[PDB]
């Protein structure tokens, strides 16, 4: 229909004027009286081998010791990142994965891929009983990010534009977060564990909330798809990491951009973003085996982590900030410090 | 140590499981939904079918449950042996299969792999154009009305937009639905593709 879409674009121009009215100065206009970080040079410590195909995602444990990895062979391997042991190596049903997660209670393991099923493995239960506890069916389209907000509730992305919630005790999808137009690629739960922002393939992130189910805010300002977002650890901001080589730091309660992180030599796509412990270093994984850092207070780069030759598919820092594990398509995980 | 011996046993198990899947040949078939899939896989995630014929083991990946836009999950098949199209023969979906063939023959992830195309459902198609020709939705393009040249006209439409600056030959087979040599054609094709990469793997080509 013509009239409702005309009303929609009229109120969209109203939203654009309302966002015009507030933007007087960005972060790089008020940060101009601080000290810079300086060119850091952190090398690897544990070049960790054991994969034979390309890997896709990882997640640290809460105790900052146990690592997880998922790849295109049927492996759901849990490592110890202190002496490079392999604590578990789960053979799962579908060889194709897309994501994985480690529970905040350190007890369960979530995984999933384009088998349209997020599966929960009951880690360290009994005498070698590393088994699938539940499988979360009732979910059309491929899956891109499972994340625990508890030991009993998961929030999983979708191919059919949802960000649904799951109760593991009965397997039933309680709430569904519809409202996107493209498929949702990543999530990042808040430290409040009541809000979560999700990015998708229509250049728009959405800040949902767990209880009332309504999308409270939708952030635009990108061009291509948004691959992997990460939340800033106060509860007020998040980085985006889109496909047009532009990590953008957005905020809450003002809905506009805070900064953009791009210059002319950055060409390829971005597919993994995670902050530091305080947030001074935004760690961004690129597509030209050149996962770099970004000083996310002065909008300039401060070092690269060139130790691969393929797509750096995933990265993640610990809860105490003492490390960063970067996993790529060359079957390796380089743990930098 | 106990945990170190457990890690070494796990690494031995992973290396032993490496050789089982490092020997098979994996294939994918797009087919655009309605096709003659249900015969060539007979002979809602990833429907994996697994057959073998004369010391070659195959693992098809019939992905149909996913949505229409597929720019985000198509890079996980970069490393497949040969794409298997399943274009049905029903003129005026016919058009949506041709738009998918443009996309996979222009991107970096599939500009070195082969395409084993299949013109399908011939005995339906031979009677479907015996009375209603191809020269209604198009102009007078064929020039005649049989099943040989009009079957070859769909082949020259698909081969019109292939770049092929490397080893990217496109086999084709006007196949029926009661065929008995269909799996021999996919065996005879994939041995030729295996020879071309092994000739490339040794280097002399």
């Amino acid at each position, epitope marked *: 229909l013509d009239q409702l879409r005309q009303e929609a674009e009229q109120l969209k121009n109203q939203i654009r004027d309302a966002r015009k009215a507030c933007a007087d100065a960005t972060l790089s206009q008020i940060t101009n009286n601080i000290d810079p970080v300086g060119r850091i040079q952190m090398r690897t410590r544990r070049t960790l081998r054991g994969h034979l195909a390309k890997i896709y995602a990882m997640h640290w444990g809460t105790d900052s010791r146990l690592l997880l990895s998922a790849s295109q062979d049927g492996k759901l391997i849990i490592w110890d990142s202190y002496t490079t042991n392999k604590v578990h190596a789960i053979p799962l049903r579908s060889s194709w994965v897309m994501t994985c997660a480690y529970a905040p209670s350190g007890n369960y393991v979530a995984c999933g891929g384009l088998d349209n099923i997020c599966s929960i493995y009951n880690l360290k239960t009994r005498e070698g009983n590393v088994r699938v506890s539940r499988e979360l069916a009732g979910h059309t389209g491929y899956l891109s990010c499972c994340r625990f907000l508890d030991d009993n509730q998961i929030v999983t992305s979708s191919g059919d534009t949802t960000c649904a919630l799951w109760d593991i005790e009965t397997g039933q999808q309680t709430t569904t977060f519809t409202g996107h137009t493209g498929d949702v690629m990543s999530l990042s739960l808040a430290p409040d564990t009541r809000l979560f922002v999700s990015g998708a393939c229509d250049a728009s992130a959405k800040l949902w909330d767990v209880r009332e189910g309504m999308c409270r805010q939708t952030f635009t300002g990108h061009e291509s798809d948004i691959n992997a977002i990460c939340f800033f650890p106060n509860g007020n901001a998040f980085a985006t990491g889109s*496909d047009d080589a532009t990590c953008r730091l957005f905020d809450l309660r003002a809905d506009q951009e805070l900064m953009t992180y791009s210059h002319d030599n950055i060409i390829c796509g971005i597919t993994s973003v995670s902050f530091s412990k305080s947030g001074r270093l935004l760690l961004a994984g690129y597509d030209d085996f050149n996962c770099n850092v970004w000083d996310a207070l002065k909008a300039d780069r401060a070092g690269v982590l060139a130790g691969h030759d393929n797509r750096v598919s995933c990265l993640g820092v610990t809860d105490d900030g003492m490390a960063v594990a970067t996993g790529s398509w060359d079957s390796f995980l380089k743990i930098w410090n | 140590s106990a945990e170190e011996k457990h890690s070494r046993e796990l690494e031995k198990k992973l290396k032993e499981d490496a050789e089982k899947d490092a020997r098979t040949v994996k294939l994918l078939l797009l087919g655009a939904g309605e096709s003659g899939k249900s015969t060539i896989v007979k002979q809602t995630g990833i429907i994996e079918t697994q057959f073998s014929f004369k010391d070659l083991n195959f693992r098809m990946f019939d992905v149909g449950g996913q949505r229409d*836009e597929r*720019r985000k999950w198509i890079h996980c098949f970069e490393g497949v042996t040969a794409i298997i199209f399943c274009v049905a023969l029903s003129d005026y979906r016919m*058009q949506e299969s041709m738009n998918l063939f443009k*996309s996979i023959c222009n991107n*970096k992830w599939f500009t070195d792999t082969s395409i084993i195309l299949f013109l399908n459902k011939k005995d339906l198609f031979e009677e479907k154009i015996k009375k209603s020709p191809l020269t209604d939705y198009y102009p007078e393009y064929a020039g005649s009305n049989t099943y040989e040249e009009a079957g070859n006209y769909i082949k020259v*439409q698909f081969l019109e937009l292939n770049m092929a600056s490397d080893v990217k030959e496109i086999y084709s087979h006007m196949t029926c639905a009661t065929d008995t040599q269909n799996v021999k054609f996919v065996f005879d094709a994939v041995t030729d593709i295996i020879i071309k990469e092994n000739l490339k793997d040794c280097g002399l080509f």
Partner: nanobody
Amino acid sequence: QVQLQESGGGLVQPGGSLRLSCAASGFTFSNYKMNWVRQAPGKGLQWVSDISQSGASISYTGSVKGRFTISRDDAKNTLYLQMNSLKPADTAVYYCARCPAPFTRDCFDVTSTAYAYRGQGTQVTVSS
């Protein structure tokens, strides 16, 4: 957002030329590969034109080889298609799509339904 508005579609007797254009607003219109897609009255979407970033690589579909022309005016931020000697088998609607990844020759889902990076297009009907 990514706005792709178009103009230049009406009724035309066959053989007569018709020039239509896409004004883009929302991104940098210098480093995205661009496509022109049509959709018949009833049939599915069909890709027509495949103009690259600079202007070197230019492709066409099967039914159109030597009757449509395409040009991106970078400074005016506009894509241009022109139909010279069109046939009455084109009573379509016309969208202009942008390929998703910049700096890349990939145009993978510019023809898909419910796609996010193409405008509502114009209507091209043909008389006789």
